[PDB]
A paper describes a structure:
Micrographs of full-length CBS from both constructs in vitreous ice clearly showed the presence of flexible filaments of varying lengths agreeing with 2D classes. Multiple maps were processed using both helical and single particle reconstruction to resolutions of between 3.9 and 3.0 Å. Both constructs resulted in maps with virtually identical conformations, and both were used for modelling. The CBS filament adopts a left-handed helical architecture with a twist of −108° and a rise of 51 Å. In the basal state, CBS regulatory domains sterically block the catalytic domain active site, resulting in a low-activity filament with three CBS dimers per turn. The domain-swapped dimer, previously observed in crystal structures, is the repeating unit, and helical formation is driven by inter-dimeric RD interactions, i.e., between the RDs of neighbouring subunits of the filament. Loop 516–525, a β-turn-β extension from the CBS-2 motif in the conserved Bateman module, plays a key role in driving oligomerisation. We also found that CBSFL-CHis is more thermostable than CBSFL by ~3 °C, possibly because it is forming longer oligomers and is less degraded than CBSFL. Though we do not know the exact reason for this phenomenon, this difference is likely due to the longer oligomers and stabilising effect of the C-terminal His-tag.
Cystathionine beta-synthase (CBS) is an essential metabolic enzyme across all domains of life for the production of glutathione, cysteine, and hydrogen sulfide. Human CBS adopts a unique multi-domain structure: an N-terminal haem binding domain (residues 38–74), a central PLP-dependent catalytic domain (CD, residues 75–382), and a C-terminal regulatory domain (RD, residues 411–551)5,11,12. The RD adopts the evolutionarily conserved Bateman module, consisting of two tandem CBS motifs (CBS-1 and CBS-2) and a surface-exposed loop (residues 516–525) extending from a CBS-2 motif. Here we show using cryo-electron microscopy that full-length human CBS in the basal and SAM-bound activated states polymerises as filaments mediated by a conserved regulatory domain loop.
Residue numbers in the entry:
A (entry chain C), B (entry chain D): 42 to 548
C (entry chain E): 421 to 548
Write the structure that this text describes.
Amino acid sequence: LWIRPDAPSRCTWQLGRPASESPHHHTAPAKSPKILPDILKKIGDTPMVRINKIGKKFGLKCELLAKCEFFNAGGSVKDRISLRMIEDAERDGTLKPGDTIIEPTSGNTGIGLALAAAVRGYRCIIVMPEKMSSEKVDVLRALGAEIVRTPTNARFDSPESHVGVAWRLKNEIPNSHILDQYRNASNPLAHYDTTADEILQQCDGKLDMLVASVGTGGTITGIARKLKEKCPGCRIIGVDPEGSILAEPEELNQTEQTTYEVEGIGYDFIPTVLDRTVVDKWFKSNDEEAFTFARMLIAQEGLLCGGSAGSTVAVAVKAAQELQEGQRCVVILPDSVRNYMTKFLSDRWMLQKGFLKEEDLTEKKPWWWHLRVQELGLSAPLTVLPTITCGHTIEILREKGFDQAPVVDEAGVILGMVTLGNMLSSLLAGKVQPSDQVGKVIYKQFKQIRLTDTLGRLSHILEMDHFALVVHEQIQYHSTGKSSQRQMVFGVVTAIDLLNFVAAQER
Amino acid sequence: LWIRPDAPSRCTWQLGRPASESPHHHTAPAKSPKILPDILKKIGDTPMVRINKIGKKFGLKCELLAKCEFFNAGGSVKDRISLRMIEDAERDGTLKPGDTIIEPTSGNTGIGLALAAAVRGYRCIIVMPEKMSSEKVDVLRALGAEIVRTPTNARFDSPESHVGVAWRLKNEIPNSHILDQYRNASNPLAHYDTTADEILQQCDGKLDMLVASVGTGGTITGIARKLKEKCPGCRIIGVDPEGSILAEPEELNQTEQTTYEVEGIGYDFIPTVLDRTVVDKWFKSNDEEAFTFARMLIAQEGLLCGGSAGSTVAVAVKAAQELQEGQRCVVILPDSVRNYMTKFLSDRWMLQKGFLKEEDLTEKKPWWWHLRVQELGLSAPLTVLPTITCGHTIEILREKGFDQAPVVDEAGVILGMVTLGNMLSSLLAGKVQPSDQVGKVIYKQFKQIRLTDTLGRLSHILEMDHFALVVHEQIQYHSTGKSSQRQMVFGVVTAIDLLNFVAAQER
Amino acid sequence: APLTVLPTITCGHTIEILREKGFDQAPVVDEAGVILGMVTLGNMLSSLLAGKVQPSDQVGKVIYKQFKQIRLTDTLGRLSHILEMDHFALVVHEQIQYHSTGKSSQRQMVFGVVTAIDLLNFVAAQER
Ligand code: HEM
Ligand code: HEM
């Protein structure tokens, strides 16, 4: 009854057999029209870009090319299989308009299927592990797909695994089908028909290697099968995060931790779709190097790719040392950075997970990074009320030779800060009159900072707020059971002042 | 000295003059190579997709086509002008490797220039208004660009406006240049050379209308100029958010509020680059309709576009009522949803801003949405300790006919929940032994929910956590100055149970 | 029933605490978890006014020390049949917790206090 994903493959493919015996319906890469009737046709024909800086940093000699699969409609390499699966199910007559699609997946296939359903009108229910980022959840919500989260540490064949939940949901919902990516032949077939043909046409046939991360296994299986059928000289390199058992031989998989922060790759079972026989070698990868390489890719090549691309490049820079000049290597970058915006892209999260250490972050910063804000020539001899009139503020600011002053009330509550030039511009434009209160022109937001903080902290703060107020806090008492507090401003600092101080110190 | 952005244009262009008299260096859309040497070449050749559902919902009769400019390298329509500006400055000899680029912009151009600098090695300093989302800030940080935020309510010519800060930074940093988008002729020229040619080639020349949002003005100015030089029959429709003064005639701009949540479009000044004479009509737009139309686009067409595209489509569905069958309309979608992930894409933020009302959210939900969780057949007659052994939990769970039970300690602290099937699978796989504690298999996360909450709240919760524990809280006292608290679990609910209840109620 | 009180607690303490949280009645339970009964604010006030008790006195003089233990699974018909004998019925649940699965432990965990008043109010609300 239950079609488990760990069953051995029933296929009989082997090298050299002509395509005419294939039981599957093969289609060549279609030529895109002048205008595509629907967004679903914007899948495929992705570019192959040359890597320039990451390779030389590690002494790589071969031409390293990256398959930017994050430019697809859904921003992932899992839009191909979604489209192919939907098309095959529709052509088989299994799926009709208004039917329900249940897919246990890691979100990328879920996003692709949600997009397909929104375009074509299906009820899409997505079952995914809990550890996936909330970005995918939000995008799915906007696409009108129903989400079901499942525990991360649940064994694949357990009752509450993502596949198990999806299967029992299919068992109980009427007119519901599962296009299971772990077992459907359409998954590897999509790559076999489009991804491999695209690669061979774009690279002019000649290449010596290919590196691809492994989830469901189609992304590597189809490409490897087509390449070995056409260009067997290519070495197929697989990747697998620590804690997963996809990589072989087995002793490579002996590790204590079963959970990893990297997403979209690695599983505790061997998929039925996967064909490990066409894999020339396997590598293990960890979160730290993967995210670091993803950040390096973003910062030095402009490829806005996710963690899996980082893992792929980290493994490639190791595996491809054997290659010499004139030989070509290819890497498959699954998805975009969009799915990981608050994840590894955030320095906060990296430091919280420990994947980045303060020494690694600070060793490359300028010489003024560790200096305190105390080193600045900050000052703020005066302040004004928020109810004060505009012309009054103008005249008083000129009375004492300042162009800006903090705004504070009688109770000591800081309201913001106002600048002379902005007030003058507002008066000239007629937006305010001298008798009007400064509330129309006041800058009512700022960041409260302390003298003890370094200039690096100030720089990190100024990326969010223009003005930072250097303040101190004193607490005064009447019997030591009767407390009172107040804060007591010093000067107004901006990136302008910081850079002026840096320039003055340099000269 | 200071080149203000509000100065009138010095150009002398007028209809019908041949290109040979142009002082500018024009280049036709280049043919992409088989493999692009660097990612910067992945700008242009974007697809034009047909809109199908948004048009008919409002009775639109014309063929509505959207220019998906969010597929560019930087995911925005502001990668074109960045590339063109960099190329023109390099070809003019103004910019050398290692030079500093300062750009006051709304982030999209900043992101494009940061990508260009990362590829080519420039010091990129980005000055933007504060109201921009943190997504752009994070992406810029990953690209190695220095960010400076400026107040939103600062007048454009004020000392601390984004343009003013950028100009004075250029004034004080050595070897620093500004490629100002508000004044550089390259901005509109990029569209005039590529965007318009792409549109005319893709649509086979025939089209009757064009709708485009307006920021710097190039996105509309260049396309309109080329179209009127080649296909004058097209009606050029501009858009402008409330609070901005770009739209004409003036009385359209009379509104109380000067600040709007929409980003990337609308300014308090007329850019020097903008040519309003080639605009056939203008429209005003507001945040609510813009974000609603963006969400509708995402949910019904799969176009992962931002708020500006929503504004453009909202204005188009109004302006294009005059068109009849057989005529074609074009809309320019600036950027991707990536820049607005935690913004309007989030229902929380929409409700907080009031752009969505609870009645509008609830009127379309199922009939069971308002029912309390109290209507379920939930139960949890037993619980177990976390230190208990695996085999003990197995035997006891079978002793009483349950397959799952919450995990709680002596003190009353809830640790999680464990399922029989997962424990059996772990034992079979050898990951645990009967004597081992349940800590290796326990699901140590969940969401605490109350009986009073509706099933809609439970559904929203289950999109994040698989298991939700229905608990109650009682507080007990010894003298009414001596308090004590405890919580007291009821049953374990999942989307499985919710959907089973829905099915049972339906039948 | 968000709160409960001890049986040894004083009368004035129960008065003040009941007003502290806007309830007029609360179940009475001890430290061991044994349910003793339930006490109402109005009856306590009447007893204080009549002089039968003082604020420092324990609630034992005014507590309603009898009730019927009922389960969520039971129908309103069963509740109506029960209320013909006892005024108050306590909706409780029972959970049993274990340390090695040979070491059992039990406890019950009250939900709310129901009477014919509440039943008829629910019926009226549903009818309208
Ligand atoms: C070229 C000649 C091929 C032959 C003779 C062949 C043979 C078969 C057959 C007979 C099945 C059906 C097994 C069943 O229903 O029990 C099957 C399924 C399948 N085929 Fe092929 N195949 C060919 C090509 C390919 C290619 C090119 C791919 C991928 C690149 C592929 C991937 C698969 C997969 C993943 C399945 C599903 C196996 C399962 O569900 O157990 N096949 N194959
Ligand atoms: C086709 C014949 C054209 C002529 C004779 C012409 C004329 C000129 C001249 C002489 C300037 C320099 C003004 C100065 O430096 O003071 C200029 C600048 C400029 N041109 Fe053109 N132009 C032509 C085409 C175009 C086109 C096709 C576009 C855009 C689609 C364009 C947009 C601009 C802009 C934005 C400026 C900057 C104006 C300023 O900075 O004040 N021009 N034009």
